[PDB]
Amino acid sequence: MTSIHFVVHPLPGTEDQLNDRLREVSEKLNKYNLNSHPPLNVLEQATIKQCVVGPNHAAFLLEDGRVCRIGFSVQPDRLESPVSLGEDLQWWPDKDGTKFICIGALYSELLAVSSKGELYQWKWSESEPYRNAQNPSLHHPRATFLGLTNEKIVLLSANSIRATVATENNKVATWVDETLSSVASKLEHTAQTYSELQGERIVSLHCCALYTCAQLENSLYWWGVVPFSQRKKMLEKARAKNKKPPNITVGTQVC
Amino acid sequence: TLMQHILRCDYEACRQYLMNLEQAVVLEQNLQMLQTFISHRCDGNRNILHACVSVCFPTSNKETKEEEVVESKDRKANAHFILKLLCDSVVLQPYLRELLSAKDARGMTPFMSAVSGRAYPAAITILETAQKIAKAEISSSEKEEDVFMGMVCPSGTNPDDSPLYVLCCNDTCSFTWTGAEHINQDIFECRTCGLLESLCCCTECARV
């Protein structure tokens, strides 16, 4: 059996501060021996494969294929357990009887992939996941755009801003939180097997708010947002090129 | 559970668990439970005996002066009793060889750690236990004196880490008897710890 402990660390911070948070957990285990809070005591005898945290709810994936979520809040009274959970835990409305293989989370919605490779969307404000009445295997409204309605997803990774998947056919697809869905035309790409990735299988995905890296059998490959320093080097090069050296006549197009 | 009893210094709980594990051995039941417990580790690749040793470490000279949640008095007493209990228990006798020859994240056996942490009582308990073990397995294809040296100071060990040498090296900081007064003593700089030229440490600190 296992126990679930919550750790919070102000950001930015330091390594040793974090080590002290962990130290406090250890101290409680060997000093208080306190009983675990009811809301997650059902998970003590369960086996957890993956766990993610959303902006208002935590979510867990079990090795038995089940998925669940619970609302949480960080208490300012202990920032000065630092986390308090609601008493209502929500198990995935599994009306299909289909097990899940991996999970992820975005700011507006929870994400999950079934053993059939189907992509599921479930917004935090919704009591049930999305379902297409005209397509029983389409549990994500934008799967058609990504082409994931005909591809078996085998791996997923998603953190807040960005979400990326690998299909069994090695096709990568990437979509972004609905809050960027309106500018996603420069953020997203449909399911494609990039030539840079062909020849190796994707073992796992490492998505983050800004970019994704795919861990392949004998190499590493990444895509997504550039850190600030290179964004600056790029902009500077562009500006310099524009300033470096006019026959302007009627009809000429100018800026 | 039992690792926590060790770390909590719950001598009674440890003893009860060992009695149940002894029954498990005798009855040929829950044998996987015993093997699982033996395989338990905490951070630093420390096994149950390493955990005992680490708990036995002192925290202040005031406690030793007096000698000359669990309270410090009971903490030390129970940690020592648990170490000795595990060493004497019939449950672990077949496995104490491996547990005592096992090396932690710093390459030290439980005995070497007891010396390094100044837990000399624990080091003595472990040394007595180790001789018992090597003298129990004289029936093996190994020489008594391979098993013994492993438990105490295993082959390939950096001689500078040898328990005898270390025991001699483990003196106290000069501050413990100089205070903040200035005396004529050798002093060292250590950039690794930010002890730049304006700062310094005494020879003993430089060594340990």
Curated annotation (Swiss-Prot), chain B:
Tissue specificity annotation:
Widely expressed. Most abundant in testis and expressed at high levels in brain, pituitary and kidney.
> Which amino acids does the record list as binding Zn(2+) 1?
C173, C202, C205
In this chain, where does the modification Phosphothreonine occur?
T109, T129
- Sequence positions bearing Phosphoserine: S54
Localization per Swiss-Prot or TrEMBL: Nucleus; Cytoplasm
**UniProt binding sites for Zn(2+) 3:** C205
Positions annotated to bind Zn(2+) 2: C190, C193
Which protein family is it in?
Answer: Belongs to the UBR5 family.
General function of this protein = E3 ubiquitin-protein ligase involved in different protein quality control pathways in the cytoplasm and nucleus. Mainly acts as a ubiquitin chain elongator that extends pre-ubiquitinated substrates. Component of the N-end rule pathway: ubiquitinates proteins bearing specific N-terminal residues that are destabilizing according to the N-end rule, leading to their degradation. Recognizes type-1 N-degrons, containing positively charged amino acids (Arg, Lys and His).
Oligomeric and partner information: Homotetramer; composed of a dimer of dimers. Associates with CDK9 and TFIIS/TCEA1 and forms a transcription regulatory complex made of CDK9, RNAP II, UBR5 and TFIIS/TCEA1 that can stimulate target gene transcription (e.g. gamma fibrinogen/FGG) by recruiting their promoters. Associates with the E3 ligase complex containing DYRK2, EDD/UBR5, DDB1 and DCAF1 proteins (EDVP complex). Binds TOPBP1. Interacts with PIH1D1. Interacts with CIB1.
What's said on domains? Answer: The UBR-type zinc finger forms a pocket that mediates recognition of type 1 N-degrons. The UBA domain recognizes and binds ubiquitin. It acts as an ubiquitin acceptor required to place 'Lys-48' of ubiquitin into the HECT domain activie site, thereby potentiating the E3 ubiquitin-protein ligase activity.
Name recorded for this polypeptide? E3 ubiquitin-protein ligase UBR5
Q: Which organism is it from?
A: Homo sapiens (Human)
Which span of the entire protein is present here? 875 to 1214 of 2799
